[PDB]
């Protein structure tokens, strides 16, 4: 009985906490969504109602988002520099090895979620998703759970799982979300982590369900898809470049920096204001399809009907409010053809999107990118339709094309072909399986050969302590050997040395693991000793050895001339905590994680 209970406990306990976390995440997503939604509705109502006078309308359009943005900023600013505007990259860094304790603290939670919510409410004017922040939150929760329960590896795994769950929840999409997270965040992942993530996602889905009460492709087609993917990749590279440079400029340019220092919220507010005017429906949004929710846009993009043909058949009417059945009517204009409108959107979102990303607040930057990709895809589809009105020898459905574009562009941006999978999941259909995937792959090829990932770019801009190789990031990763960053301080307990001396040493340092040396002159290692054990022995060094104190031999030895990178890799893979260094056999020093972290920091920031 007791034995059975014991057996049940560890594994079961592990499962249970994860499940709980998942549930919590689901709850957060539901509640957050609800909070967003009502606000959005209210805003819409206000827009409808305030009147026909222009100024008032403008104010309604412009003020509400601005205020929200400001609110988001303010909460972020008060706690710590690395709180707001950071999720995935930070997580990645953590996974790589270097720990930033500021990131996992729970005092930060309440201020960030609210900000995220505000951002969401602000919506399609500001044009930002929720992913990264959500992921961060999830990770934090996981960390908290771990702490409550209370090795490094296990903790890391837990964090990963949490992240996966977070990703799933935002997407409302279990199967692929976790995979995507794994692709983006980590490296040296295990299947069990993935499984855990999946489980969490499933739990979240279940929770959502529970809470529901409240509330045949041809051969040229493939070629076309590939072309689309390529185009996306091209575009994505450019986008990535822009992201890399704009952020740098912001960091750099002195006046801007000063302004930020004075008031980040002010900067954010200003940005919002700038966005808002451009958006404004009757002035310029009639061209940009402005008057639409975030999901609404996506829906419009991935619509089954082929727009150009429809337009040709009949001029669509501009309604008072956007039709729930016919979202795509927003994209049409008489003077500017649907194609033209799409082009405009592409031009303008790109211009704006980077700016939006820049502004300091809790916000996600995946969804917008996806939407952009979809738009591009749709344009291509439309073009194809125009070319071949009959179709290829079944007609060309541009929805599929749009979907492919969304999959592809995002993947290119993110260096992750899980994007395709995610897209498929969102669709609900696995009939577009190959071509889309191929397109995504193509995009990745063109993007990953030229540029770093969006996330990677962001990390570079930050100068966060992440060791691995990134494209377009000049740094001395191969040069720094162990000699430069190793700890020269050692506590050599040689056989030959007297007992009093040893005692004194013990009294002084009290290190976790003392090295055992052959003799004082040679300084050559013959294994290791633990401190507590030594103390015990003393209470009760050749003499000591004779008496019978256990010599745990050194399993693995680094040279001083070995590269930092290799060492780091070793540390990551074998799950080690410390490791001694030998030069011609001599105990020169002692590599821990701390030293490695320090080295990484140095590399990042001169």
């Amino acid at each position, epitope marked *: 009985l007791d034995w059975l209970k014991r057996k049940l406990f560890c594994v079961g306990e592990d499962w249970y906490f994860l499940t709980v976390l998942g549930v919590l995440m689901a709850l957060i997503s539901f509640t957050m969504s609800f909070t967003v939604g009502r606000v959005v509705r209210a805003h819409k109502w206000l827009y409808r109602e305030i009147g026909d006078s222009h100024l008032l309308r403008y104010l309604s359009w412009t003020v509400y988002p601005v205020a929200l943005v400001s609110f988001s900023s303010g909460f972020s600013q008060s706690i710590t520099p690395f709180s707001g505007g950071s999720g995935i990259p930070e997580l990645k860094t953590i996974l790589s090895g270097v720990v930033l304790e500021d990131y996992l603290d729970i005092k930060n939670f309440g201020a960030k979620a609210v900000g995220l919510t505000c951002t969401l409410a602000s919506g399609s004017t500001i044009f930002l998703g929720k992913v990264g922040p959500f992921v961060h939150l999830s990770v934090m929760i996981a960390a908290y759970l771990g702490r409550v329960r209370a090795n490094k590896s296990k903790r890391n795994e837990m964090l990963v799982a949490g992240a996966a769950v977070g990703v799933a929840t935002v997407f409302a999409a279990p199967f692929s979300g976790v995979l995507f997270c794994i692709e983006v965040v980590s490296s040296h992942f295990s299947v069990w982590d993935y499984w855990r993530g999946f489980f969490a996602a499933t739990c979240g889905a279940f929770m959502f369900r529970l809470l529901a009460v409240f509330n045949p492709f041809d051969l040229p087609e493939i070629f076309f898809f590939v072309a689309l993917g390529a185009i996306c990749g091209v575009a994505s590279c450019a986008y990535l470049f822009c992201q890399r440079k704009f952020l740098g400029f912001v960091k750099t340019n002195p006046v801007l920096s000063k302004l930020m220092a004075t008031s980040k919220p002010l900067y954010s507010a200003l940005a919002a204001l700038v966005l808002a005017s451009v958006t404004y429906p009757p002035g310029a949004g009639r061209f940009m399809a402005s008057r639409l929710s975030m999901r609404e846009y996506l829906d419009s993009l991935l619509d089954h*009907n082929s727009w150009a*043909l*429809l337009t*040709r*058949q*009949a001029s669509p009417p501009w309604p008072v409010e956007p039709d729930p059945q*016919n979202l795509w009517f927003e994209w049409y204009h008489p003077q500017f053809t649907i194609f033209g409108t799409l082009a405009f959107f592409l031009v303008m979102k790109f211009w704006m999107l980077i700016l939006a990303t820049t502004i300091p607040m809790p916000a996600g930057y995946f969804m917008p990118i996806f939407i952009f990709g979809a738009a591009i895809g749709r344009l291509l589809g439309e073009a194809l339709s125009v070319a071949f009105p*009959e179709g290829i020898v079944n*007609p060309i459905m541009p929805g599929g094309y749009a979907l492919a574009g969304a999959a592809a562009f995002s993947g290119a941006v993110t260096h992750s072909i899980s994007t395709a999978l995610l897209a498929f999941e969102l669709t609900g259909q696995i009939v577009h399986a190959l071509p889309v995937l191929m397109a995504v792959l193509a995009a990745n090829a063109i993007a990953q050969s030229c540029q770093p990932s969006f996330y990677d770019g962001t990390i570079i801009v930050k100068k966060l302590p992440y060791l691995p190789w990134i494209r377009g990031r000049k740094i001395s990763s191969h040069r720094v050997t162990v000699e430069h960053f190793m700890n020269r301080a050692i506590t050599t307990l040689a056989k030959d040395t007297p007992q009093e001396e040893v005692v004194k040493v013990v009294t002084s340092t009290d290190m976790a693991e003392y090295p055992l040396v052959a003799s004082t002159e040679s300084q050559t290692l013959v294994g290791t000793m633990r401190r507590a054990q030594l103390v015990q022995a003393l209470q009760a060094l050749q003499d000591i050895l004779a008496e019978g104190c256990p010599v745990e031999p050194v399993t693995l030895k680094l040279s001083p001339e070995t590269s930092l990178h290799q060492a780091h890799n070793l540390f990551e893979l074998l799950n080690l905590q410390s490791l001694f260094v030998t030069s011609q056999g001599r105990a020169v020093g002692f590599v821990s994680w701390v030293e490695l972290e320090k080295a990484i920091s140095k590399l990042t920031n001169p």
Partner: antibody
Amino acid sequence: DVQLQESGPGLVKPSQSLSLTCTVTGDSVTSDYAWSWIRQFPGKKLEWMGYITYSGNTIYNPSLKSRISITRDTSKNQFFLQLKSVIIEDTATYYCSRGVDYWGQGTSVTV
Amino acid sequence: DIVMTQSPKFMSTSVGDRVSVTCKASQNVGTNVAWYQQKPGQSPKTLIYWASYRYSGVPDRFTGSGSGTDFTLAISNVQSEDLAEYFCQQYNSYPLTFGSGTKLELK
């Protein structure tokens, strides 16, 4: 106020190619619309013929690809059919239209 | 060709009553369906270009609805001037198809 007006011969001998001139007033042919042809039988059942784009690429009903041929003159703003291999079953009242929005008054073709 | 099967074929009502003509498509059309009125002799004038969007210069009593595979034209407060045939046309797919047509007499 876009207005379409058909014109052509009513009585026709079978196995002799017919042609109908549809003139436009109020709108240019070079605009991006579906300049389409439709016909209604004596039993009051509508059948879609086809249409030309702004550029000139013609699209037809799959059932009548062989016989139908539709053209335009951009100078006069008109539409010309060249319906060949005429049969007594083809006897109908024809209708030249701008997709779905505006329709012509139509002419009664007889074989 | 995607067939547009409609019903009921014949109708006979008084002045003031409601009439509802139903159209059904074999494949999914979306909302890309237009309604016509043809009085005997004249050309068929369009009423509702997209399901539930009336044309300019048409009375409000002609209320259309539906999406996907089924659609309805609803007419309330029928007058003596509405003795006519009513067709539904789809225009999602090529070729463009039509309904057979509903003749409407009055008492």
